[PDB]
């Protein structure tokens, strides 16, 4: 019966617990799904927690913990968020978290399917079309690190 006040806090706690473990668990993912489904407030909480993570908490984690977190988020992303993604400068560990997330997504959905999905969404930070002077190079470069297509296409479009 937790009130709207601490829902965010609860979610944070859950996340931290997830992090503590050796690896990402279906368990936590399912729990997240259930809570999300339940009430709009919890959806909001999960969102804001996500924001908190990529904003500030993200860069404190280790590659194992961070990876796990990414996986968890990917699982959630594949269904119960919109792919809203506030994402050149910030590549300490956040970018590798992103890598993990993308990997998770691809593994779950599929490559072409994923592309289609993202195409439907806005994707400003991930997939900029307006060139911004050798800035797409960066995103393009990063996505070449993992098995992704359409970067080449984007560059062609941009010249």
């Amino acid at each position: 019966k937790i009130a709207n006040n601490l829902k965010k806090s609860v979610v944070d706690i859950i996340i931290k617990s997830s992090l503590q473990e050796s690896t990402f668990s279906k368990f936590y993912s399912i729990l997240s799904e259930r809570m999300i489904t339940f009430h709009r407030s919890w959806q909001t909480a999960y969102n804001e927690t996500f924001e908190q993570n990529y904003t500030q908490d993200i860069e404190d984690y280790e590659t194992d913990q961070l990876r796990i977190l990414g996986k968890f988020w990917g699982h959630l992303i594949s269904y119960e968020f919109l792919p809203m993604d506030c994402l050149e400068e910030s590549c300490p560990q956040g970018r590798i978290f992103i890598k993990f997330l993308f990997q998770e997504l691809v593994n779950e959905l599929g490559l072409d399917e994923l592309q289609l999905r993202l195409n439907s969404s806005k994707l400003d930070g991930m997939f900029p079309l307006e060139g911004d002077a050798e800035h797409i190079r960066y995103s393009i470069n990063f996505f070449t690190a993992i098995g992704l297509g359409l970067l080449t296409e984007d560059m062609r479009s941009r010249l």
């Binding site: 473990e21 050796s22 690896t23 990402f24 668990s25 279906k26 368990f27 280790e62 194992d64």
Partner: protein, 378 residues
């Protein structure tokens, strides 16, 4: 526990949760299943870490170095087999142990104590789990170490701290440890009986516990304790006779029964005064504001009231007060004065307290006395 008649036909989403292993005062005991890495995770993880190892091995080759465990730390505890198996004290012996799984399987057919973990071997694969996490989490979850010991007879031993503990005979110890919890005041039907020579009200028989306690108070020990305390009190009074204007400190010799008899009480010490005393209204020891009414006494009495508490009756002050104005205001075992003092010692918790009337400037002496005795009565 989903709809049993439907569930037989198709898989349901789990709808209704039954209560499994329940309890009154439900402290959420964590399971074990949460603290074991579920297999799929273990296997994806394994694939990752082994891939990493492979890559680093190539790096080592290229660089022409020994790929030490300083570089592979973190992944040490992950994967199948566990990465630890690469650098244990004798791989170059275990290299020649082919057909190991099969041999472990067929221990089944050739032994009495068939091993429960036939399915793996630690030499070959390493610790495939680690339940220190489970231990720690569980203790955190039962209100911590701090709180568990309130259930136990830790308070009875009287250590400086529980942290200073570290450096049908074996289960007797176990029983004695949870004496207070197991012999509990609040209880369903258990009929009350007391062990012989003692005030150890067992709420329904337990054999082992009874055996323990009886051995604990062998040689009439309870009675001895009672008498000892009485003697001490007498000595104290003798010492501080002229300070509190006392004519005579006499011991009213009761039966040996009194020590542990609980339905009644004759007074242990009777206190003949020089002048009339003007004792305060009855109160506890630490109750500071003692009210001096116009009532006077030419004679007080001191009674001890040994008790052996439980996890439920572990306050003494209330009990001693009850005892005081039970035996006074009861027409069996009358004291020479209805005005007097009563001490009671919780032997199970080392929680002294006393209630009753107070001669002026007496209370501090009694408080100090109790403090001393508790610190070190023989």
């Amino acid at each position: 526990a989903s709809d049993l008649s439907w569930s037989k036909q198709t898989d349901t989403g789990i709808t209704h949760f039954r209560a499994g292993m329940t309890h009154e005062d439900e402290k959420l005991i964590p399971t074990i299943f949460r603290y074991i890495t579920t297999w799929e995770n273990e296997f994806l993880d394994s694939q990752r870490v082994w891939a990493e190892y492979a890559t680093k091995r190539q790096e080592a080759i290229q660089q022409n170095r020994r790929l030490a465990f300083e570089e592979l730390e973190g992944s040490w505890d992950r994967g199948i087999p566990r990465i630890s198996t690469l650098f244990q004290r004798d791989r170059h012996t275990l290299a020649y142990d082919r057909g190991h799984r099969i041999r472990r399987e067929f221990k089944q057919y050739s032994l009495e104590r068939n091993s429960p973990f036939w399915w793996t071997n630690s030499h070959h694969d390493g610790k495939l789990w680690n339940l220190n996490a489970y231990r720690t989490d569980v203790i955190q979850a039962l209100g911590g170490i701090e709180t568990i010991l309130e259930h136990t007879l830790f308070k009875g031993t009287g250590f400086n701290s529980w942290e200073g503990l570290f450096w049908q005979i074996p289960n007797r110890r176990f029983t004695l440890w949870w004496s207070p919890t197991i012999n509990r005041a609040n209880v369903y039907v258990g009929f009350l009986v007391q062990l012989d020579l003692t005030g150890i009200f067992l709420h329904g028989k337990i054999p082992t516990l009874k055996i323990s306690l009886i051995q604990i108070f062998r040689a009439h020990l309870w009675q001895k304790i009672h008498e000892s305390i009485v003697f001490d009190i007498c000595q104290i009074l003798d010492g501080e006779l002229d300070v509190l204007q006392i004519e005579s400190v006499t011991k009213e010799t009761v039966h040996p029964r009194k020590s542990y008899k609980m339905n009644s009480s004759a007074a242990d010490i009777t206190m003949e005064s020089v002048h009339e005393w003007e004792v305060s209204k009855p109160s506890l020891l630490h109750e500071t504001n003692d009210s001096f009414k116009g009532l006077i006494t030419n004679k007080m009495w001191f009674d001890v009231q040994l008790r052996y508490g439980d996890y439920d009756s572990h306050d003494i002050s209330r009990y001693v007060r009850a005892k005081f104005l039970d035996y006074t205001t009861d027409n069996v075992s009358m004291y020479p004065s209805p005005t007097g003092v009563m001490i009671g010692i919780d032997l199970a918790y080392n929680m002294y307290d006393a209630y009753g009337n107070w001669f002026n400037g007496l209370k501090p002496l009694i408080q100090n006395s109790m403090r001393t005795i508790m610190k070190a009565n023989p």
